[PDB]
C-alpha cells in the first residue's frame, strides 16, 4: 500500500528470439488485466468521478499493450480469425526502407536592382519558409488520413477485456479475500499468493 | 442506446417506419402504440435479429406506461384518405387524434423529442404547440414538423433533370409541407449547377405537386406509404444522432422560428443535445425575384394554415 | 470576475484554501486570487476526475459571473481560463481511463512541477495518426466535458447571487479580501452547497464481506464507420 | 499575396487550396507565354533586321537599335498610368454625386 | 486617429493614434472591426486603381487580416467553431481544419464586402482627404472629422450579415453527403442488417 | 496454435527482393525500362502521389506471384517434406545424398527450365 | 450494377421487400411487377434519393418485357392466409402463381437467379424445378428456396435465451420451412456455448412454432410481412454479393442437393458467380441423438411434401 518510485518493454523482446505467436496474446492479456479489476471493483454510477488519471503504471501498461499490438500486426506477413488490413503502401515502404538500410549498412525583394535583364528580381531564398510550411501541412494531411489500422486493435483489446471480466467475475472471491489481506497486512509476497488462492 | 416510441405504428405509414426504425444502430428500445392491431406488429418485429427490443402497448389505458423514459416521440397517427370524405372532417379526425396524443405525451414525458407526421403538418404543429402550452410543458426547441419528404423529392427531381450523381445533390426547401407553400431553393443547390428559366419553373411545380401525383397514381388507394416512411425514418435517425452529441446535425424541419413574421416556418435548422440549437438564417437572403415572389405568395397561405391550426387547438371542450 | 472566482471557489466543500484576492495588483489592469491546494492532494501524487472538474468549474467561475451579470456580450477577460479549462479537459480525454476513448491509440511516445500533469505537452509526446471520425469523437468529448462544467458553473452562479454581489461590494470597498473574511461572510448566508467531488472510494479494512461489481468493464470499443455508399 | 484568386491569401489549411495555389502560377506562366508569342509574332520584320545587325556588328548601342525599332516597329498602345485613372475616376465620381444632388433637389423642390 | 503623414514609405500606414490605456475588454464586434480595418489598403487600391496596380506592400495587408481572423476563430471562443482555446501549432485535429477554413473564408467574404461597401459611400470624403494630403502632406484629426461629417454620402446596397452555421453546414466529417442522406440497408458485415442514414453501424 | 517467428527474417527479405525488380533493374510486371532508383542513390524520383499506388500494386503482385509459385511447387511435395522432417528428427544429421534418396524413393517432383514467375512475357534467346 | 426483378411486389411482403431492395448499394435497376396496384408502389419508390432505378410492369402482357437482362428473379407473390380456407386451396393458388411466374422466367430469362418465397416452399421449389425441366432450361445451381427466416429466428431466440451478442450468433438450420421439418443445429452454434436438454427442447419447439405464434398473434390479419421482407432482402443481397465474385457467400437455402435421399433439402450452401458452387458437408454429421431422431422424423414429412409438390406440378392441363 506504499507508493513506488520502467523499461521492461525491451527486455521481453530481447529475450524472445524464436518464441511462439500465442505468448503475445498471453502477454497482452496479463498487461491489460489491472484495469479490468479496477473497473469491476469500483462502485458503479459516478459521472466518472473516481478515476485515477495520469499515474505511474497505467501509462506503462498502455504503452506495452500498444507495442505488443504493433509487433503482432507488423509481423502477420487457426490462431487469428482475421488479419490486419495491411495499408497498401506498407509493402513498398518496407522495401525502400530495407534498401536504404542496406545501403547505409554497406558502407525582401532583392533590393539591389538588376542592371542586366538576365538577373532575377527575387532572391531564390526569399520565399523558402512558406514552401516548407505548405509541404509540412500537406504531408501532415496526407499522413493523418490513412490509418486504416486503428479500429482493429481497439476491438482486440475489447475482447481481451471481456474475457478478463468473465474470468475475474467467477473468481471474485479470490481477489476479494486477497484485497482484504492486503488491507490487513501492509506487505505481501507470492507465497501468500499461492496460500490464499483457496 | 435510446428509446423511441411510435404512436400509431399499425397504420399505413407506421409499419414501414417502425421496420426502418428497428434497423437503426442507435435504437435499443421501441415502444409501439396504436388503438388496435399492435400485437401483430410487435410479433412481426420481435423475430428480427436486431438488439433493439420491441414492446407494444394497446389502448389509451396502457398509453401511460408507453411513455416511460422515452427520448424520441414519433407521431405518424392519422387515418389515410377515404372516399367521400372532405378536408374538414379529415382535419378534425387527425387533429383530435394528435390532440389526445400530445395531451398524453405532455402528461407523461414532457422532455422528449416530438415529431409530427400527420397531414397537414402545417396546421398540426401549431395544434401540438398550443396543447403543450395548455399544460405549461411546451418547449419550442423540442417540437418538429417533418417536411423532409419535400427535400428528398427535390433532390431526386434535380438529380434526374440535371444528370448529377444523386448522393451529393441537396436542395433547400422552405415554407411548409402542403402544396404551394413548399418552395425549393434551386439557386442554392449543391453541387453548383446552372439552371434555366423553364427548367426551374417545371421543377418547382413538379416538387409542389409530387404529392398529388402520388395520390392520383394510386387511384385512391391512400397516400405515400414508403417515401413518407423514408423521410420520417431519416428525420428520426437525424434526431437520434442529435441526442448522441454530433455537432453537425443539420436538417430541414417545420418548427417555430422568428425568421419571418410567421410563428412557424419550415427551414434549415441545426439540432443539438437539448433540441433545436440553431436556425440557418442565410436561407432567406440571396434569393432571386422568383423565390422572392414565391415566398410572398406562400406567406399568406401558410399564415392561414397556422391560424386554422391555432383556432382549432383552442376550441372549448 | 474575481468575485465569481471566489464564489465558485467557496461554494465547494473541499476546494483549495483561499489565501487572499487583490484587485489591480501594482497598477496593472487585472486581478488575482491565490489558492493553495490541500496537503492530501499533494501527498496523493495523482489527480482524480472530480478534482479536475473542480478546477474547470472554478476556472469557469469568473467569466461565468461576468456573463451572468453583464449579459451575453462576453469579453476576453477570461481567455486564460478559456485556455486552462481546455487543457485540463484534454487530460480528461487523453487519459487511458476514459470510458469512450480508453482503448484507442491516442498520443504516443517518441521514446526517451504541478498537481495536474499535462501529458499532452510532454516533449516526447507527439499526436498519433488519427482518422476523421476518431478525431470527431475527440472533439465531441471535449465539447461535452466543457459544456458540462459550463452548465454547472452557470447553474451555481444563478443559484446564489447575493453572496456574489456581497463579495463584489467587498472587492470594491477594500480592494483586497482574504479567505477568512470570505468564509465569515457566507457563514450566516446558507448557500446552495455543492456535492463533494473528491470523496475517496474506500474499502473497510477487515469487514469480511463480498463487495460487489456491476458485472462488467465500462470500456466501449471504438467502432464508428458509415456504411459504404450506393452504386457499387 | 499579389494574386486575385480569393484575395491574395498565400496560405490555406486544406490540401485542395494548397494544391490550387500552384495552379495559378502555371496558368500565369501560360498567359505570359501566349502573350510573348503574340508580341514576338507581331514584330517579325524588325526581328529579322535586328538579328542581321547583331550578327554583322556583334554589338549595338541605344541609338541604332531604337532607330531600327522606329523604322520597323508595330503599334504599342500604352496603358494609362495611375494619374489618368485617378482623373477619370474623380470626374466620374463628381458627375455621379452631382447627379445625386439634382435627383435629390428637383425631386424635393 | 490624431495625426496623418505621407512623408515615409513603410509596410504599415504612417498613421498615429491617441493611445489610452485601459483595454481590459474587447468584444466580438471589436475583433470584427479590427479585421475590417486590417485589409483597407488592398481594397482601396483594387477599387480606384484596379487589380493589376496593387503594390507588393498593400497586397501584403490581407495576410494580417488572415492572422487576426484565425486568432478570432481559434483563440477567442465566441464564434460557432466551439468554446475551446486552440494554440495554432498542433492541437488542431484534422476534423476542425475544414471548419476553420470555411469560417475564415466566410469572415473574409464579409470583411471584404464591408470594406468595399464603406469606402464607396464615403468616396467624396475619401478623395477630399486624399487631395488635402496631396497638397499639405500633414493632416490633423479635426479636419478629418470635419470632412467626414460634411462630405456627401452616396447610398449603397446593404451588405449580407455574417453567419457561421451557414458556412459550417457544408463542413463535416462525411462531407457534402450527410446533408442529403440517402440511407442504405446493408447485410454484408456479420449476420445482421442495418438501415443507416449517415449513422455509423 | 503453434506459430513461428523464424521465417520473418526471410519474408522481409522477399519484401526487399521484389521492389528491386520494380525500382532498380526494371524487371517489372510489364518489362518496363522505367528506373527510379540507382545503386548510389539516396532517394527516389518525384514518384507522383497517386502513382505510388500503382507500383505498390505491382510489387504486391510480383510478391504474391512468387508466393503462389512457391506454394504450388511446395504443396506437391508434402509427403517428401514429412519424410525429410522425420529423418531430420530421428537422425539429427542429413546430407545431400540422403535428401536425394528421400526425394527419389518418396517421389519428389522437380521444376524444369525455363524458370519464370510469369510466362505471359517470356521469350527465347537467339 | 446488377438488375433485380421482384415478381409480386405489390402484395403484403412485396412492398417492404421492394423498399429494402431499393436502398441497397448493389441494386441499380429494379422491375416491380404485379397483376394490380404496382403503379403506386413504383411512384412511391421513385421519390427516394437512392440511385437504384425503379420501373414497373403491369399484367402478363408486359411480363415479357419485365424479365430482360435480369440477374436475380425474386418471387414473393402468393396470397396470405384468409378466413375459412384450407391448406389445399392455398397450395393450388400459390402453386399456380409460381408456375406462371417461373414459366415466364423460363420463356424470357433462363440465366437469372430464381428465389421462390411462396408458401409452402417445401412443395413449391420442386414445382419450379419441374416447370424449368419441362422447357429444357432447368439449372439446379440457379434455383433457391428462401429459408433464412428460420436462421434469423434461431439467432434471435438463442441470443435472447443464452444472453449473447446478436451479431455474433448464427445457428445452423436444416430440413425445410414448414413446422416440424425445421431442425436447428444447436450443437454447432458459434460462439461456443453449452446448452442443457430442456433449453434445447424449448428452443427447438419455439423455432418450429414461431410462425404459428405470429399467425395467431396477428388474429388472422395475415402472416409475417416484415421479418419475411427482412429475410428475403438478406438473401437477395447475399445472391447479389455472389454475383460480384465474393468468395465467402455462405447462406442457408433450400436447394436440390444430395446430402440425404431427399432430392431437395435445406442446408448451408456456398454460392458463386454461376449460382450454387458448393454445399457445406459439415452440417449433416456430428449430430447428437436428438438431432438424429428429429432428422429421421422430419425426413418422411419432407418426402411427403416434396412428393405432393412434384405430383401437383405434373398434372395434365
With strands numbered from the N-terminus, the spatial order across the biggest sheet of chain E is 2-1-3
Total of helices of chain E: 7
Q: Using the alpha-carbon principal axes, give the shape of chain F.
A: elongated
Which structural class best describes the helix and strand composition of chain E? Answer: mainly alpha
Number of strand elements of chain E = 5
Backbone shape of chain E:
elongated
Class inferred from helices and paired strands of chain F: mainly alpha
Fraction in beta strands of chain F: under 5%
Radius of gyration of chain F (CA) equals 19 Å
Helix content of chain F: 40-55%
Q: What portion of the residues of chain E fall into strands of 2 or more residues?
A: 5-15%
Give the helix proportion of chain E (percent range): 40-55%
Which sheet architecture does the biggest sheet of chain F show? Answer: none
How many distinct helices of chain F?
A: 4
Distance between the ends of chain F: 53 Å
Subcellular location (chain C): Plastid, Chloroplast thylakoid membrane
Binding site for Zn(2+) (chain C): 1, 5, 81
Function (chain C): Probable ATP-dependent zinc metallopeptidase.
Active site (chain C): 2
Can you tell me about this structure?
The structure is cut from a larger assembly and holds 1 copy of chain A (198 residues), 2 copies of chain B (317 residues), 1 copy of chain C (232 residues), 1 copy of chain D (109 residues), 1 copy of chain E (201 residues) and 1 copy of chain F (126 residues). Chain A has 198 residues and is mainly alpha-helical. The two termini of chain A are 23 Å apart. Chain B contains 9 helices and 11 strands. Chains in contact: A-C, A-D, A-E, A-F, B-C, B-E, B-G, C-E, C-G, D-E, E-G. At the A-C interface, helix 3, helix 4, helix 7 and helix 8 of A face helix 3 and strand 3 of C. It is classed as membrane protein. The entry lists the keywords ATP-motor, Ycf2, FtsHi, membrane protein. Cryo-EM structure of the Ycf2-FtsHi motor complex from Arabidopsis in Apo state.
Keywords for this entry:
part of a larger assembly; 7 chains; A: 198 residues; mainly alpha; 58% helix; elongated; C: mainly alpha; 3-stranded antiparallel sheet; two-stranded antiparallel ribbon; 9% strand; globular; chloroplast (chains B, G); transit peptide (chains B, G); chloroplast protein-transporting ATPase activity (chains B, G); tricarboxylic acid cycle (chains B, G)
Helices and strands in order, then pairings?
The structure is cut from a larger assembly and holds one copy of chain A (198 residues), two copies of chain B (317 residues), one copy of chain C (232 residues), one copy of chain D (109 residues), one copy of chain E (201 residues) and one copy of chain F (126 residues).
Chain B: E1 2-7, H1 14-22, E2 27-34, H2 39-45, E3 53-58, H3 63-66, E4 72-75, H4 87-108, E5 113-116, H5 125-134, E6 143-145, H6 148-162, E7 173-174, E8 183-184, H7 197-217, H8 227-243, E9 250-256, E10 264-272, E11 275-279, H9 289-313
Parallel strand pairs in B: 1-2, 1-4, 2-3, 4-5, 5-6
Antiparallel strand pairs in B: 7-8, 9-10, 10-11
Chain D: H1 15-42, H2 44-57, H3 62-72, H4 82-108
Helix pairs in contact in D: 2-3
Chain F: H1 8-24, H2 51-74, H3 78-91, H4 96-105
Helix pairs in contact in F: 1-2
PDB class: membrane protein
Keywords: ATP-motor, FtsHi, membrane protein
Entry title: Cryo-EM structure of the Ycf2-FtsHi motor complex from Arabidopsis in Apo state
